[PDB]
């Protein structure tokens, strides 16, 4: 069965404003959730595609995705997830899926964030397990080469480079931790000197924040122009060299961006045209390998699988 983005409209037509509404007041205490969710909705789709693994915590028959490398300690906004599906069961009981609910919720953060907005294509329905072997593969870590991004982004079905480049435009807010750019400001690939690719200034910066003996866990942002705005500055930073972390400045100065620079070049000078391409990614990324009709089912708590 197709997705579509009037699955909805009759059974449950503002699920949207749910969603949307929840997102609002946290966003009061908490500044970063819009970042955090997109994350988890990527998280999610990566390893055996949207189906709301990643929200599965631990059982007897089965390890929760949480505790994947990338997601352990660093993933976060559950909590919050549990809230919007509360109040989506009150108003449309057993009808919208945590799979489907994250996908709407990432496209709302974005668009609170400043992002563009579009409506996404809905009737995914909810996994029956976690696959933490499989997620602790399939993830993409950031010291990742070019063509190693690329090999992971074709291997769940996103082939095309506007998929990568678009995407990661995802990292246009959020934060990072010292713990995963200590290489790049002291011993870059054993060489006992920084990352050659990182802006000499903004090295000093960053070593400011994440000091040779420091807490490994202390955040940074990831867009230094616009730490918590969405849009197009993320590809500006690339152009002169403060890409972050490797997979970032990687999509701009690697040997092997013969076709995804022209890409950066095109994002980082139109809004538009970026905007364009993140939402067409996005629903792309948001159809990899779905469950629809009578697989899977829908979780009435996230955390847990149905009995029955
Ligand atoms: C190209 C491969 C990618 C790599 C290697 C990667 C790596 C990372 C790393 C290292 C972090 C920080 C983890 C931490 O400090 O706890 C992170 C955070 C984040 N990533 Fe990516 N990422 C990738 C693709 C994406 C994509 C496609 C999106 C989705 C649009 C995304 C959205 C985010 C956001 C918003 C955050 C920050 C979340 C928060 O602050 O809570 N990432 N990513
Ligand atoms: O966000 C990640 N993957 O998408 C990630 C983060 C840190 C280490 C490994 C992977
Ligand atoms: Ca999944
Ligand atoms: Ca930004």
């Not at 291997?155 to 990661?168: E, H, I, P, T, Y």
Request: aromatic share 8%; glycine share 6%; with cysteine.
């Amino acid at each position: 069965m197709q997705l579509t983005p009037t699955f909805y409209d009759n059974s449950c037509p503002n699920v949207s404003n749910i969603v949307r509404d929840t997102i609002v007041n946290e966003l009061r205490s908490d500044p970063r959730i819009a970042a955090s969710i997109l994350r988890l909705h990527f998280e999610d789709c990566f390893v055996n595609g949207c189906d709301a693994s990643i929200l599965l915590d631990n059982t007897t028959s089965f390890r929760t995705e949480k505790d994947a490398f990338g997601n352990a300690n660093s993933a976060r906004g559950f909590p919050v997830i549990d809230r919007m599906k509360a109040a989506v069961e009150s108003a449309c009981p057993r009808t919208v899926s945590c799979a489907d609910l994250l996908t709407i919720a990432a496209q709302q953060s974005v668009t609170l964030a400043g992002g563009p907005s579009w409506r996404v294509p809905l009737g995914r329905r909810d996994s029956l397990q976690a696959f933490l072997d499989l997620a602790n593969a399939n993830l993409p870590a950031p010291f990742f080469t070019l063509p190693q991004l690329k090999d992971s982004f074709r291997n769940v079905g996103l082939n095309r480079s506007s998929d990568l480049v678009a995407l990661s435009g995802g990292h246009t807010f959020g934060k990072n931790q010292c713990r995963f750019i200590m290489d790049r400001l002291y011993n870059f690939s054993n060489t006992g000197l920084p990352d050659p690719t990182l802006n000499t200034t903004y090295l000093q910066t960053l070593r400011g924040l994440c000091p040779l003996n420091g807490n490994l866990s202390a955040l940074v942002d990831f867009d230094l122009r616009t730490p918590t705005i969405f849009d197009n500055k993320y590809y500006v930073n690339l152009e002169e060299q403060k890409g972050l972390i490797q997979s970032d400045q990687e999509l701009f100065s690697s040997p092997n961006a013969t076709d995804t620079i022209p890409l950066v070049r095109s994002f980082a000078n139109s809004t538009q045209t970026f905007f364009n391409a993140f939402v067409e990614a996005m629903d792309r990324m948001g159809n990899i390998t779905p469950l629809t009709g009578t697989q899977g089912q829908i979780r009435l708590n996230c955390r847990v699988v149905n009995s029955n």
